[PDB]
């Protein structure tokens, strides 16, 4: 009924880990619905952009977001409470159960984040830090998209500047890292990445190089390998993300049609 929630309605329950802004607990809202609350560092957000802007963050409803059911801000710390996922982050899940993964469960996860990702272009909605440790996966193997948009009211200039030791080169197109320039063409090359990660089983992309000689190499045009996992029109798929050329990147409607002819062929 108000995107207010009283936090005298939340129970904290256990520790689910640290974001970008802090712990994030695991909790229930009027005893009975599963949320995760993050508590909002001191100093990691600027809070007024976040509030002034959260009504249209929360108005985002499709299947494969990861929820955003509302805030508590008549208080110090602030509190954002989101949909809870049991399988936690797909990057550690991905790492955890590594060697039993099978390629049409792979094909399942790309597909869950590219509707997801087909949504948010539609509404012209950019998640600006796509990569597997920001997907999360539900009790059912669901992949959803989690914590779209919230990079931009980051406090924390190692995460927000593009020299900085935080910020998400590797998921980078060269128009961010030179330009700043993001755009649904930026988040279609952090998706290229992303199924990338899917298909390598959670290794890191470019693991070989730094930061800052990832930027150099794909500035001259090295691109990701093809994962062992993945067949030929895997490849093509993820590899038609990283042309340098962001106006000649499918758009996420193009990459959910080819995952689904993948699909119906095998
Ligand atoms: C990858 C490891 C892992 O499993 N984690 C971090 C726990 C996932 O836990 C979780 C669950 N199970 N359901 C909903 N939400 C979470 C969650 C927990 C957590 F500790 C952190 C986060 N992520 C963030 O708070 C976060 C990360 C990055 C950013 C970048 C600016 C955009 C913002 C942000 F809020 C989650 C989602
Ligand atoms: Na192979």
């Given at each position: 009924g108000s995107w207010e929630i009283?936090?005298?309605?939340?129970?904290?329950?256990?520790?689910l880990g640290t974001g970008q802004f802090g712990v994030v607990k695991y909790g229930k809202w009027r005893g009975q619905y599963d949320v995760a609350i993050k508590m909002i560092?001191?100093?990691?957000?600027?809070?007024?952009?976040?509030?002034?802007?959260?009504?249209?963050?929360?108005?985002?409803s499709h299947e494969k977001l990861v929820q955003l059911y509302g805030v508590c801000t008549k208080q110090r710390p602030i509190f954002i409470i989101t949909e809870y996922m049991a399988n936690g982050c797909?990057?550690?899940?991905?790492?955890?159960?590594?060697?039993r993964?099978?390629?049409?469960?792979?094909?399942?996860?790309?597909?869950?984040?590219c509707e997801a990702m087909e949504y948010l272009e539609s509404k012209?909605?950019?998640?600006?830090?796509?990569?597997?440790?920001?997907?999360?996966?539900?009790?059912q193997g669901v992949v959803k998209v989690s914590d779209f948009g919230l990079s931009r009211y980051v406090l924390d200039?190692?995460?927000?500047?593009?020299?900085?030791?935080?910020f998400p080169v590797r998921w980078s197109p060269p128009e961010v890292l030179?330009?700043?320039?993001?755009?649904?063409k930026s988040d279609i090359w952090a998706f290229g990445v992303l199924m990338w990660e899917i298909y390598s089983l959670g290794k890191m992309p470019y693991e070989r190089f730094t930061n800052s000689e990832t930027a150099e190499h794909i500035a001259q045009?090295?691109?990701?390998?093809?994962?062992?996992?993945?067949?030929?029109?895997?490849?093509?798929?993820?590899?038609?993300?990283?042309?340098?050329?962001?106006?000649?990147?499918?758009?996420f409607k193009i990459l959910l049609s080819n995952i689904l002819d993948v699909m119906d062929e095998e």
């Open positions: 009283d936090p005298k309605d939340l129970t904290f329950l256990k520790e560092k001191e100093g990691s957000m600027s809070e007024d952009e976040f509030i002034e802007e959260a009504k249209v963050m929360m108005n985002l797909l990057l550690n899940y991905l790492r955890e159960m590594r060697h993964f099978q390629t049409q469960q792979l094909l399942e996860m790309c597909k869950d984040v012209q909605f950019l998640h600006r830090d796509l990569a597997a440790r920001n997907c999360l996966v539900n009790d200039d190692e995460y927000t500047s593009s020299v900085g030791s935080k030179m330009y700043s320039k993001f755009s649904s045009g090295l691109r990701l390998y093809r994962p062992h996992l993945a067949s030929e029109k895997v490849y093509t798929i993820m590899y038609s993300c990283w042309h340098e050329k962001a106006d000649e990147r499918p758009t």
